Scaffold this active site. Structure first.
Site, PDB file in Angstrom:
ATOM      1  N   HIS A   1      32.985   2.047 100.961  1.00  0.00           N
ATOM      2  CA  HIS A   1      33.376   3.415 100.640  1.00  0.00           C
ATOM      3  C   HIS A   1      33.127   4.481 101.707  1.00  0.00           C
ATOM      4  O   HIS A   1      33.529   5.637 101.521  1.00  0.00           O
ATOM      5  CB  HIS A   1      32.709   3.842  99.326  1.00  0.00           C
ATOM      6  CG  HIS A   1      33.608   4.619  98.411  1.00  0.00           C
ATOM      7  ND1 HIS A   1      33.283   4.836  97.088  1.00  0.00           N
ATOM      8  CD2 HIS A   1      34.813   5.188  98.674  1.00  0.00           C
ATOM      9  CE1 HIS A   1      34.290   5.522  96.580  1.00  0.00           C
ATOM     10  NE2 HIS A   1      35.243   5.761  97.499  1.00  0.00           N
TER      11      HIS A   1
ATOM     12  N   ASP B   1      33.690   5.900  90.057  1.00  0.00           N
ATOM     13  CA  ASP B   1      32.564   5.186  90.660  1.00  0.00           C
ATOM     14  C   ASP B   1      31.344   5.222  89.723  1.00  0.00           C
ATOM     15  O   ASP B   1      31.234   6.095  88.864  1.00  0.00           O
ATOM     16  CB  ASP B   1      32.245   5.943  91.960  1.00  0.00           C
ATOM     17  CG  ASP B   1      31.548   5.109  93.003  1.00  0.00           C
ATOM     18  OD1 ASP B   1      30.630   4.362  92.658  1.00  0.00           O
ATOM     19  OD2 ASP B   1      31.906   5.246  94.188  1.00  0.00           O
TER      20      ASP B   1
ATOM     21  N   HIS C   1      28.538   5.500  91.048  1.00  0.00           N
ATOM     22  CA  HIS C   1      27.705   6.343  91.923  1.00  0.00           C
ATOM     23  C   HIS C   1      28.424   7.618  92.416  1.00  0.00           C
ATOM     24  O   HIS C   1      29.648   7.649  92.534  1.00  0.00           O
ATOM     25  CB  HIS C   1      27.251   5.529  93.153  1.00  0.00           C
ATOM     26  CG  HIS C   1      26.695   4.174  92.815  1.00  0.00           C
ATOM     27  ND1 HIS C   1      27.481   3.044  92.841  1.00  0.00           N
ATOM     28  CD2 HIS C   1      25.445   3.842  92.409  1.00  0.00           C
ATOM     29  CE1 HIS C   1      26.700   2.059  92.446  1.00  0.00           C
ATOM     30  NE2 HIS C   1      25.461   2.491  92.172  1.00  0.00           N
TER      31      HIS C   1
ATOM     32  N   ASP D   1      27.844   8.995  95.473  1.00  0.00           N
ATOM     33  CA  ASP D   1      27.981   8.881  96.934  1.00  0.00           C
ATOM     34  C   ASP D   1      27.857  10.228  97.655  1.00  0.00           C
ATOM     35  O   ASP D   1      28.622  10.526  98.588  1.00  0.00           O
ATOM     36  CB  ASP D   1      29.319   8.239  97.296  1.00  0.00           C
ATOM     37  CG  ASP D   1      29.470   6.846  96.724  1.00  0.00           C
ATOM     38  OD1 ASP D   1      28.446   6.253  96.304  1.00  0.00           O
ATOM     39  OD2 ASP D   1      30.614   6.355  96.705  1.00  0.00           O
TER      40      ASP D   1
ATOM     41  N   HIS E   1      27.750   4.383 103.084  1.00  0.00           N
ATOM     42  CA  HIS E   1      28.756   4.247 102.027  1.00  0.00           C
ATOM     43  C   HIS E   1      28.314   5.023 100.779  1.00  0.00           C
ATOM     44  O   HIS E   1      29.058   5.117  99.802  1.00  0.00           O
ATOM     45  CB  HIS E   1      29.007   2.770 101.656  1.00  0.00           C
ATOM     46  CG  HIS E   1      27.873   2.115 100.925  1.00  0.00           C
ATOM     47  ND1 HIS E   1      28.050   1.015 100.112  1.00  0.00           N
ATOM     48  CD2 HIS E   1      26.549   2.399 100.889  1.00  0.00           C
ATOM     49  CE1 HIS E   1      26.887   0.653  99.603  1.00  0.00           C
ATOM     50  NE2 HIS E   1      25.959   1.477 100.061  1.00  0.00           N
TER      51      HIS E   1
ATOM     52  N   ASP F   1      36.344   3.261  93.492  1.00  0.00           N
ATOM     53  CA  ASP F   1      35.317   2.287  93.839  1.00  0.00           C
ATOM     54  C   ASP F   1      35.320   1.272  92.697  1.00  0.00           C
ATOM     55  O   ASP F   1      35.029   1.606  91.539  1.00  0.00           O
ATOM     56  CB  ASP F   1      33.930   2.921  93.926  1.00  0.00           C
ATOM     57  CG  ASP F   1      32.853   1.915  94.335  1.00  0.00           C
ATOM     58  OD1 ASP F   1      33.070   0.690  94.169  1.00  0.00           O
ATOM     59  OD2 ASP F   1      31.781   2.349  94.813  1.00  0.00           O
TER      60      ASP F   1
ATOM     61  N   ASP G   1      33.322  -0.748  91.624  1.00  0.00           N
ATOM     62  CA  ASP G   1      32.133  -0.893  90.773  1.00  0.00           C
ATOM     63  C   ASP G   1      32.088   0.170  89.668  1.00  0.00           C
ATOM     64  O   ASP G   1      31.083   0.318  88.970  1.00  0.00           O
ATOM     65  CB  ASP G   1      30.809  -0.896  91.582  1.00  0.00           C
ATOM     66  CG  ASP G   1      30.479   0.447  92.228  1.00  0.00           C
ATOM     67  OD1 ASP G   1      30.844   1.508  91.697  1.00  0.00           O
ATOM     68  OD2 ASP G   1      29.809   0.453  93.269  1.00  0.00           O
TER      69      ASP G   1
ATOM     70  N   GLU H   1      35.363  -1.190  98.090  1.00  0.00           N
ATOM     71  CA  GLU H   1      34.238  -2.065  97.772  1.00  0.00           C
ATOM     72  C   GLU H   1      34.513  -3.455  97.181  1.00  0.00           C
ATOM     73  O   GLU H   1      33.655  -4.033  96.514  1.00  0.00           O
ATOM     74  CB  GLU H   1      33.223  -1.299  96.906  1.00  0.00           C
ATOM     75  CG  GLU H   1      32.617  -0.043  97.584  1.00  0.00           C
ATOM     76  CD  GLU H   1      31.650  -0.348  98.723  1.00  0.00           C
ATOM     77  OE1 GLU H   1      31.328  -1.530  98.966  1.00  0.00           O
ATOM     78  OE2 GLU H   1      31.189   0.603  99.384  1.00  0.00           O
TER      79      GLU H   1
HETATM   80  N1  LIG Z   1      23.035   5.912  96.226  1.00  0.00           N
HETATM   81  C1  LIG Z   1      22.723   4.509  96.609  1.00  0.00           C
HETATM   82  C2  LIG Z   1      23.942   3.598  96.314  1.00  0.00           C
HETATM   83  C3  LIG Z   1      25.229   3.985  97.033  1.00  0.00           C
HETATM   84  C4  LIG Z   1      26.484   3.356  96.434  1.00  0.00           C
HETATM   85  C5  LIG Z   1      27.678   3.412  97.387  1.00  0.00           C
HETATM   86  B1  LIG Z   1      29.087   2.996  96.805  1.00  0.00           B
HETATM   87  O1  LIG Z   1      29.374   3.759  95.602  1.00  0.00           O
HETATM   88  O2  LIG Z   1      30.134   3.342  97.747  1.00  0.00           O
HETATM   89  O3  LIG Z   1      29.223   1.589  96.477  1.00  0.00           O
HETATM   90  C6  LIG Z   1      22.475   4.579  98.132  1.00  0.00           C
HETATM   91  O4  LIG Z   1      22.788   5.800  98.614  1.00  0.00           O
HETATM   92  O5  LIG Z   1      22.077   3.692  98.835  1.00  0.00           O
HETATM   93 MN   LIG Z   2      31.426   4.391  96.073  1.00  0.00          MN
HETATM   94 MN   LIG Z   3      29.732   2.559  93.786  1.00  0.00          MN
END
Ligand SMILES: N[C@@H](CCCC[B-](O)(O)O)C(=O)O
Ligand SMILES: [Mn+2]
Ligand SMILES: [Mn+2]
Ligand SMILES: N[C@@H](CCCC[B-](O)(O)O)C(=O)O
Ligand SMILES: N[C@@H](CCCC[B-](O)(O)O)C(=O)O
Ligand SMILES: [Mn+2]
Ligand SMILES: [Mn+2]
Ligand SMILES: [Mn+2]
Ligand SMILES: [Mn+2]
Lengths: 308, 308, 308
Positions: free
Chosen positions: B96, B119, B121, B123, B136, B227, B229, B272
């Site tokens: 991402h 998502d 998350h 991000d 990401h 995303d 997930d 992702e």
């Molecule tokens: N907030 C966690 C997880 C990030 C998730 C990233 B994603 O949504 O792009 O898979 C981190 O900053 O390491």
């Molecule tokens: Mn993401």
């Molecule tokens: Mn995610």
């Protein structure tokens, strides 16, 4: 109003012969004994013996036209007779092509009935739009008045008289509709709640809207034609045409619980259960037991409880 | 309005190298051929060749800053050029972190666009709130105008110009937000529908409210950054950061079906998907096939059916 | 308002001895350490030592009456004392028969409280309606004022004083109610949302309606008695009486998130977790971890995120 179970061990509407065993598996799961625990009086007419047609060449692309036509003619006569005696008919499926005979015989006694079709498919291809030629995906086309004369006379079905108009049916659960079928429902304006509508509205609002649409003007007989593949494959895996993203177990029971509460159920079809198609023995038991729970729900069993 | 597929085999925004294979798996699943069956004209720009940076020491805790910064600069230029030619850009993910370049190039041609972020998350960590250092999970922080100057200049990103304000984005599916990220969305007042809101409202009302919120004043270009997930691990198991209790298959398709119906989709990101992370070969096939179904839905495929 | 964990390793209310291990499994999963990460101050009273009764012959059909009666009398005293000290009591289950003592001691300090019962069962059989004789399916019958004198005095329970009236309790999740129990809830008019109502309304409207029903007139203490089998077996498989078609993981968390937001939670019961009943070791881990997530949710953990 007593109930009459009618077995229909038929599979000529599609290629897999195991659906013929649907009735037996349902009975073996204790279907009749449990229905006798309800407020209704139960009667088992038994299973029908369908006269096969040896020389049954395809009408164009349509397979087994004469065998499918005759078995349905036999069924209609049987259903009409029990309806004539003030009883609710329960047809144990069998490929969905047997809905032609079930609905036809019902409409002979109750011409004012409406139809609720729970399925992942519309089953409305005509002998000219179908790409497979399997008649279990064409039953609605032989019953709609608006489609009369839209395709050539098919051998074995000259006894059929279109008995329902486009405004008398509602679909619930659609998610695998052919291009021709979609053109037909949009053109004729048939009411439907595809998975998109169930997601948007919720099953509660879906049942409310189907009842006001069909029973708004006046009350009348209800015919529920239930194709087990209406529910997601996780719940009813033993079927010939499973499609992902279907109705849940909870939603399936909600539909039948609401239909019971109307007090207007007049005819029922439990179709497409094929006991030879599990991935495992329990996938079979899962599918058969769910079909039995749905049937019992149509006749009074509620999740909130029951007492005499 | 034609479509242009753009591959982004990149994985420097996180530790698992397999996401680089996302584009290939999506194409191998027949992604392009199926899009050519829609009403749109399809064009495959191919995959981008990202210039790696050998000496790429961590900026504080932030890993691979220069490699992530340059790959995104290359992407932005490519996306802006196709947008400049009146085409809808489809970016095949890749971790991402590539959303920085995708959204940046899009906003160059359509400065009035809004963003829908699906998502688990947010991000939105900044180089100073992040605890992992993986980029990401920081893309939104480099794009928000309100966060400009809230953290030190990171190497490789001096080319970025914050292009979206807090009121121009909506989150759907949140269920794993860091303390710092939560403080940020509450303080800046960013609109979101976490799993709690989806449970309360239902996906139907969720899509209605996100559209009135973003498209109430006037209509404008939509950028959907998806995303994988966002959906529950049961549906999309092959991802680097799976979280239980996510969106269903049905809900994911409802989101994309509604976005198609607006006629305002302008840019799309499918991110992702990591084909080397299944627990089994089918968990992989399940994830890749779902991502393909979501993409097709954004461009017209409906569960109710289609016809020409 | 601090929290006080109270262990109740008891299993005489039913036949499977493994529920005695519920408290230990919950603690081993890190229950206390995680609660200390919330805004509340945590205190672990430890586990109670229940005095067994050697000669405990069945009162009619009721099994272990004296042992169940005494263990509950001990619990009530303990709960009332902590409530007397302005703390929220958290009872770690144990078969559901321990709700008699938990609710009784609570009502001693807060006679105006209401009860929210999440379960697939109503647990309201009386010594005369029960067909199994297991006391974990009769707790509500000993607490309702309307049922006082509806059955013979049971040995070991002369210390009980019915503390709640029919209008003070709400059921959520019902789907396995005995005929006698159904007659009772219909006759006495007890408020409930069976799975049918959850399907019809959606969990959002369900929580809204239970709060207006119980907290409409005035605000007051809330007692949440949570039976882990309220959720579907796919989520909480390690229980003695699993029933298909239950609440989802998402719905379970929504219930507890809404209860936290009222600021009225006063007493909590987490019951029927049996760590010796998995089909596999992970089915156990799944059930224990879900029970822990539900507990944390009752005390502030939200899916949208948290920060200090
Ligand atoms: N907030 C966690 C997880 C990030 C998730 C990233 B994603 O949504 O792009 O898979 C981190 O900053 O390491
Ligand atoms: Mn993401
Ligand atoms: Mn995610
Ligand atoms: N429309 C496809 C599938 C038919 C499905 C039939 B059914 O719903 O009865 O299982 C066909 O005509 O071959
Ligand atoms: N009503 C059945 C089942 C009781 C269920 C008890 B419970 O909800 O606490 O697990 C019985 O009385 O034996
Ligand atoms: Mn079907
Ligand atoms: Mn069918
Ligand atoms: Mn229970
Ligand atoms: Mn219980």
């Amino acid at each position: 109003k007593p109930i009459e179970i009618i077995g229909a061990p038929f599979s000529k509407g599609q290629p897999r012969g195991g659906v013929e065993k649907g009735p037996a598996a349902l009975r073996k799961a204790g279907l009749v004994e449990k229905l006798k625990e309800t407020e209704y009086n139960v009667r088992d007419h038994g299973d029908l013996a369908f006269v096969d047609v040896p020389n049954d060449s395809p009408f164009q692309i349509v397979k087994n036209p004469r065998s499918v036509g005759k078995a349905n003619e036999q069924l209609a006569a049987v259903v009409a007779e029990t309806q004539k005696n003030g009883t609710i008919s329960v047809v144990l499926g069998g490929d969905h092509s047997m809905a032609i005979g079930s609905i036809s015989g019902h409409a002979r006694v109750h011409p004012d009935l409406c139809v609720i079709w729970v399925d992942a498919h519309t089953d409305i291809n005509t002998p000219l739009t179908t790409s497979s030629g399997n008649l279990h995906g064409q039953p609605v086309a032989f019953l709609l008045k608006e489609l009369k004369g839209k395709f050539p006379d098919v051998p074995g079905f000259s006894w059929v008289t279109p008995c329902i108009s486009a405004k008398d049916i509602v679909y619930i659960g659609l998610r695998d509709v052919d291009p021709g079928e979609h053109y037909i429902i949009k053109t004729l304006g048939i009411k439907y709640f595809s998975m998109t509508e169930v997601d948007k509205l919720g099953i509660g609002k879906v049942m409310e809207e189907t009842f006001s649409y069909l029973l708004g003007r006046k009350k009348r007989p209800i015919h529920l034609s239930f194709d087990v593949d209406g529910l997601d494959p996780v719940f009813t895996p033993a079927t010939g045409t499973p499609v992902v993203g279907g109705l849940s177990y909870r939603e399936g029971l909600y539909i039948t619980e609401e239909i019971y509460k109307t007090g207007l159920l007049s005819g029922l079809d439990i179709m497409e259960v094929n006991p030879t198609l599990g991935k495992t023995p329990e996938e079979v038991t899962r599918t058969v037991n769910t079909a039995v729970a749905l049937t019992l729900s149509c006749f009074g069993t509620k999740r909130e409880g029951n007492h005499k």
